[PDB]
Amino acid sequence: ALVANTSNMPVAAREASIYTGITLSEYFRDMGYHVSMMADSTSRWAEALREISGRLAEMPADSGYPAYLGARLASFYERAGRVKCLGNPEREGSVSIVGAVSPPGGDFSDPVTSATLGIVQVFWGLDKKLAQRKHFPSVNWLISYSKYMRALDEYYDKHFTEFVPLRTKAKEILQEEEDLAEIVQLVGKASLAETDKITLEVAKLIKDDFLQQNGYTPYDRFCPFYKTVGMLSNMISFYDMARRAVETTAQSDNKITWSIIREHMGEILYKLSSMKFKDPVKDGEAKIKADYAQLLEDMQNAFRSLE
Amino acid sequence: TFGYVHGVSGPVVTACDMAGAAMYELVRVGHSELVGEIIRLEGDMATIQVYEETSGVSVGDPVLRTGKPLSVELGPGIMGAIFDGIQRPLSDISSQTQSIYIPRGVNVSALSRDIKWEFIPSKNLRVGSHITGGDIYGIVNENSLIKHKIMLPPRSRGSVTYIAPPGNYDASDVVLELEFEGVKEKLSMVQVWPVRQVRPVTEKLPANHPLLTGQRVLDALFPCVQGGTTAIPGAFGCGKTVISQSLSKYSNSDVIIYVGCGERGNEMSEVLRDFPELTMEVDGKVESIMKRTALVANTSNMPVAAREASIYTGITLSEYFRDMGYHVSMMADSTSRWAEALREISGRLAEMPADSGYPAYLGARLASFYERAGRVKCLGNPEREGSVSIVGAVSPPGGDFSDPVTSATLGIVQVFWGLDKKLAQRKHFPSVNWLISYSKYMRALDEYYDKHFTEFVPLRTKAKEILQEEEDLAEIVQLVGKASLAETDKITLEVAKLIKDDFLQQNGYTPYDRFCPFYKTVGMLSNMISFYDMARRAVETTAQSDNKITWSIIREHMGEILYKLSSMKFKDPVKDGEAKIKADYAQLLEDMQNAFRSLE
Amino acid sequence: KDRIEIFPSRMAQTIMKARLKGAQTGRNLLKKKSDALTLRFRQILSFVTLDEAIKITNRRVNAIEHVIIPRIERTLAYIITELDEREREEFYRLKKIQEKKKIIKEKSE
Amino acid sequence: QQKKIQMSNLMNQARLKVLRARDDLITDLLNEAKQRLSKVVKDTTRYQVLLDGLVLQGLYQLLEPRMIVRCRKQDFPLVKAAVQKAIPMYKIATKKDVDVQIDLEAYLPEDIAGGVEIYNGDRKIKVSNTLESRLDLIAQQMMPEVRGALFGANANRKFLD
Amino acid sequence: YLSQPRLTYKTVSGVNGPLVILDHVKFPRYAEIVHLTLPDGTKRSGQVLEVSGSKAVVQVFEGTSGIDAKKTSCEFTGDILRTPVSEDMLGRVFNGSGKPIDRGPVVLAEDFLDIMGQPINPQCRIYPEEMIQTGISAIDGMNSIARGQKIPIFSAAGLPHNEIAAQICRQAGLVKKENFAIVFAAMGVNMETARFFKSDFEENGSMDNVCLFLNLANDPTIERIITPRLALTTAEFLAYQCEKHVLVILTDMSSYAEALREVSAAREEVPGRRGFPGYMYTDLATIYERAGRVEGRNGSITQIPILTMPNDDITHPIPDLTGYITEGQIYVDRQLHNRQIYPPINVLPSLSRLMKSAIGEGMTRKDHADVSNQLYACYAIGKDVQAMKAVVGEEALTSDDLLYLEFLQKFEKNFITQGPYENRTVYETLDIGWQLLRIFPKEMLKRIPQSTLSEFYPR
Amino acid sequence: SAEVEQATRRQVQGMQSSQQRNRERVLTQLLGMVCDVRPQVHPNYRI
DSSP states (O other), X not given: OOOOOOTTSOHHHHHHHHHHHHHHHHHHHTTTOEEEEEOSOSHHHHHHHHHHHHHTTOOBOGGGOBTTHHXXXXXXXTSOEEOOOSSTTOOOOEEEEEOOOOOSSSOTTSHHHHHHHTTOSEEOOOXXXXXXXXXXXXXXXXXXXXXXXXXXXXXXXXXXXXXXXXXXXXXXXXHHHHHHHHHHHXXXXXXXXXXXXXXXXXXXXXXXXXXXXOTTSTTTSOOOHHHHHHHHHHHHHHXXXXXXXXXXXXXXXXXXXXHHHHHHTHHHHHHHHTGGGSOBTTBOHHHHHHHHHHHHXXXXXXXXHHO | OEEEEEEESSSEEEEESOOSOXXXXXXXXXXXXXXXXXXXXXXXXXXXXXXXXXXXXXXXXXXXXXXXXXXXXXXXTOTTOEEOTTSOXXXXXXXXXXXXXXXXXXXXXXXXXXXXXXXXEOSSOOTTOEEOXXXXXXXXXXXXXXXXXXXXXXXXXXXEEEEOOSEEEOTTSOOEEEEETTEXXXXXXXXXXXTTSOOOOSEEOOOOSBOOOSOSTTTSSSOOBTTOBEEEEOOGGGOXXXXXXXXXXXXXXXXXXXXOXXXXXXXXXXXXXXXXXXXXXXXXXXXXXXXXXXXXXXXXXXXXXXXXXXXXXXXXXXXXXXXXXXXXXXXXXXXXXXXXXXXXXXXXXXXXXXXXXXXXXXXXXXXHHHHXXXXXXXXXXXOOEEEEEEOOEEOOGGGOSXXXXXXXXXXXXXXXXXXXXXXXXXXXXXXXXXSSOEEXXXXXXXXXXXXXXXXXXHHHHHHHHHHHHHXXXXXXXXXXXXXXXXXXXXXXXXXHHHHIXXXXXXXXXXXXXXXXXXXXXXXXXXXXXXXXXXXXXXXXXXXXXXXXXXXXXXXXXXXXXXXXXXXXXXXXXXXXXXHHHHHHHHHHHHHHHHHHHTTO | OOSOOOOOOHHHHHHHHHHHHHHHXXXXXXXXXXXXHHHHHHHHOOOHHHHHHHHHHXXXXXXXXXXXXXXXXXXXXXXXXHHHXXXXXXXXXXXXXXXXXXXXXXXXX | OHHHXXXXXXXXXXXXXXXXXXXXXXXXXXXXXXXXXXXXXTOSHHHHHHHHHHHHHHHHHHOOSEEEEEOOGGGHHHHHHHHHHHHHHHHHHHOOOOEEEEOSSOOOOTTSOSBOEEEETXXXXXXXXXXXXXXXXXXXXXXXXXXXXXXXXXXXXXXXX | OOOOOOEEEOOEEEEETTEEEEOSOSSOBTTEEEEEEOTTSOEEEEEEEEEETTEEEEEESSOOTTOOSSSOEEEEXXXXXXXXXXXXXXXXXXXXXXXXXXXXOOOOOSEEEETTOOOBOGGGEEOOOSBEEOSOGGGTSSSOOBTTOBOOEEEETTSSHHHHHHHHHHHOEEOOOOOEEEEEEEEEEOHHHHHHHHHHHHXXXXXXXXXXXXXXXXXXHHHHHHHHHHHHHHHHIIIIITTOEEEEEEEOHHHHHHHHHHHHHHTTOOOOGGGOOTTHHXXXXXXXXXXXXXXXXXXXXXXXXXXXXXXXXXTSHHHHHHHTTSSOBOOBOSHHHHTTOSSOBOTTTOBOTTHHHHSSTTTSOTTHHHHHHHHHHHHHHHHHHHHHHHHHOSTTOOHHHHHHHHHHHHIIIIIIOOOTTOXXXXXXXXXXXXXXXXXXXXXXXXXXXXXXXXXXXOO | OHHHHHHHXXXXXXXXXXXXXXXXXXXXXXXXXXXXXXXXXXXXXXX
């Protein structure tokens, strides 16, 4: 059940739209349902507050916004969470809120961006340069954060046990790539360690064949979590085995390098890059998991025969 | 003399029935007697800026009008005391209350009235004689160091009708009575002077007498003069303690005033803890520095009026002793802290901001601050003279020099003792940058130096030339390694090092190097420069062909001379008298010239 | 020329600070490349290729130091000044608004 | 691991349990004081003295040209005397002629131990000058001394400044 | 005590946003606390911000919705906001207004203090001496906190500044070569984090020595302003009157600063630099400087303000005005966080100006100062060598460079990386330092005197 | 867990015993303070 309010509607309704939406959200929250509330824009709400603050001739703060902008946003954002409902039935519901801050730029001095960041636990910032490169979804992966890590660790360890350590390693690889990227732009890969060459290539494998997806295709309109972790599990396993091979044979006779690995098991990189296409629902869950297990067995045999 | 509070809008209190009040007068608002000032006036109502918290002030509270504007109370007991920025004795507040807090609305007289001071009249004045402003009619014996001279307050004169006999008087008694045109004025030992008013002098004189600090660097190369104004950067790693202690302990000034403006609590504690523990030899006895010092303490959480007023309270205390014929040296711990306090007040008054957010008049206030320093001819018939020097520090946010406060200060002060942190990291003290530092009194002091020392001026000129060339050669050395380098340049590089090591560097934690008398400073430099010239001549006059002198030959040949030159700093003035040290330096000069002579 | 000619804004201020940090890192990394080449060059003293590599690297380092960064710093200082000028005119208008409100209130009494 | 958490919860709740018990002692003491004050208002001469004081203090705090005194119906004879006395004393102290009336149509709930409420002429300003309100006001303001008297001084408190 | 019956007014001149304008109020005070009763029986609190004659202007703590100009009554207390303080309140959890939210009783007061207090007389301020170890090696062996200094933690938004703050509360204490308490105040905290602090403190047994104040993001913005004053008001009682050492942690001062701007707007004050009040400087000093040692008493207060840097710019007035009046900084970085290092504290840009006095024989261990200086140089060099390696390669490095790379990798993995539940005392932190320093031969440890090396280096 | 409840009961009993020792004295003083009205005119009254 959506609430429709366009930019040509009166400023008072533009302000009240958010309050109407969250009121309906809490109403169903108290039924024991899990409610997910999506906002189109909170900058338009803040704009309504600036317009009314001016009309009322009250003293403004930064960039014309009311000094209490933060209080209004906190009031909205704090009306959410998993709760134990009132009433005899002991039911428990939840409201999730997904806000939306329209970016005048990447400068978080923006009064609305700044006030939102001080409240929200998860921030999915969208990078301008990735959007310009048509890399979708466009997520910075360096300025974003989620403060629910420790809260979900219990869930992940109970059901999967593998996700938490894959998550840690994936973040290490992406950050290491950014620092290596700064040097490559300067020296042109003239001098790289073999481990650094692997990090750059696996990080690209991740950027192109894991973090990139076309959400209008049957295969990537929705990727179920078991598959998301499945994909990462294989890519990280590859990373560790590729890193072990070059460092284990380093300072010896039969030194293994990336050029040897890429030529030796090129079909493995093709298979890894093909995981996005397994097409869930059209294909079965049991088969997709089995297929990913096969990739793991093929990789292990590829490195065993290389060494 | 009372009005009533009409309303409170925060730190601003509106009074009614207060028609008889002047702008920038003083009021004590409410039953706690909160300190504030009147800024805007309209009709019989006044707008009061209250320095302290206004919580609890009611409509209808009394307001006591005090006729004097913000003023400093001047009289016996000023020495050895620590004051708030608006002249509140902190050593009495903490001792009369047994508290650790400054009470809200605390009202402790600046000078205690329970001390019976030893007062001796001048014995030259008689009843019926004529006295004018600035005249001295008696002296109070405070301590062994500073005599506290009682002057007739400025802007007062007349015929003397009573002179107190010698005896023990407190600050509430009557010492002198005078009548002018039938109007009798009864004066005690304490005078009050508005802090924003400049105390008059007979004439403002040029500053010609050096400020004889104990450091070889910040003296030989970058002189300060009594009555002059300088600036010192204040950064954590700059080692500013060396100047503060050296200036307060061994200076040839009579009275030291240390002014805090609004620093970190722990920084104010460090100053308050260090100062009482400093001593100096005077008449052969070791005396506490606090017997000839006064200190104003202001932390960052003090009322903004005090933090802004602190700088003017300090200089008013300085001028008070200036008028006694003393040489006063005042240090403002951070003029950036003051500028911050000033900007806060401008903000509270909703004034239009100017450069980097500071008030439009920032420069005018700083200019009028430093203009109050200088050597003067005092008021009063005694025809005495004195001076005030300012060695205020600057600490702009970020360490940049673009901040209007540091930029304006540098355009006002005539000496800049630029300090550095890199030197401190290298353990080289005092931490003087050398290339940035300058002094614009070098011409003013040329008369003194010519009259008393003669050779000092060409020596300091050559010394700066050697140091600058050492910097200029840095690029050549980096690209060469002293291989494809002239022997004359090797002399410059290695001698410049000698200067940096065994002259400009000074170790204040050693008993022999605590204070370097000027005659020793010029002695040390004379021999080093004389060596420089001899080495340059030894190479240049023999550099034609066949048989030439090189630095390798000089260094190996007369290594004992280079050692003796380095050893010169160890001549302890406490044990080796002026004649002995000069005699030893003369012997090095002769031995040095003969060492080169043996090469020709 | 003298400035990058980016219109004064908080966004431009942020970009210039990031651009300056990048330029400073490049200066230091190329300086280290030059120092490494200089040590090897002096140790040998495939020789002329080092003399050209040093001159080419030092020329790029010198340009960053003498052309590109000064220009970024001038741009950043320009932006900072212009931003304070915009802040002032906002203060002025707000002050007059507060005074006009006070005047209106007095008339109503 | 879980044993440590259990120990933390037991000790933290045990601390709250004893603190709540101490708060019950204060609550019971205040309730007993109210019963003891109820015994006082059952008097006549002593209660009239309380009313004389309460009316005067109310009038002096309100300082309005017209006032209405509201009381419990059964206390009207005593309040009438209190107002008749309060008026000439008020006028001398304040030099202001105030018309003080007693409300004969509305009365305070009979369950209030005693005391009065004072209203201005338009009944827009009221003084909470009943006995129960005064007791609660004083009991809280003096509470730091109640704590020490009943449970002992704080052995770790060395400076009272 | 006053013993004066309270006046309740039903005369209301008007209501304007958070403000209620009253009329005919007798001798009103500024900062007076009043209580409102709405027609629905709902009670609200507020504070008088302006008193212009009989026209008292009160800001309501809660929302002003539902308030009319005909029936709403305003009860005046006749006094200002004074906080009931006691020793017993340590181990309790309060909201911004000072009310318990832990199902315990209201505080049974030993005294009442004005929460604004007074400045500490500088003549009786004692320079900081001994150390208070935090349990976090990155800030015990590198930039320790002296017993009396005020050193802030600057972080960007999204970094784990709250997890470190909680860890400090669980682990912090005296060196122990019973008289230590922590007062923790969170301003503008969201519900999920507020739960984190409350539950994490209770579960790990630390609560016995913690006084916790939670001001939630959706709580009144004025209450957020007194919250840090109530925390310090308690700290001053505990520290100076009860002869004990109090660590005060003020979390999210940036959220305080935003609440302060809101109050300024309520007064119709013209905003200053970047929208903040012209008096923001003295307001922060008013809070921060209520700390340190005092002559003649054995108690002390330290502070660790924690501040989010808007747009990660240290130039912003909030971290700039804070740092300008504090003694050094801890500085939490982002690169270390993205590399999955916890704690993500960068030792090169951090500084503790009082460390020189905090550490040394008789306070921690003889070798403390020497180990810190050598580790700092080794890390700075390792970073410098790492930058070189990225350009010249591994084969172009000499043995000394490789030792610095080994130190760099093991320094971050062993010394800085800790985990949230491992408590490393000052002596264990130094021992870990030596384990890293013994990577190098004695001759490369140029900043450690030979006497120190001979005593500690071997074994 | 028994040791925690055992100590709690002892602490409550102690508080109950302590407050009894002077319960009547504290109550007596409180009744005296409330009974003594001490009327006063506001200190800022000026007529």
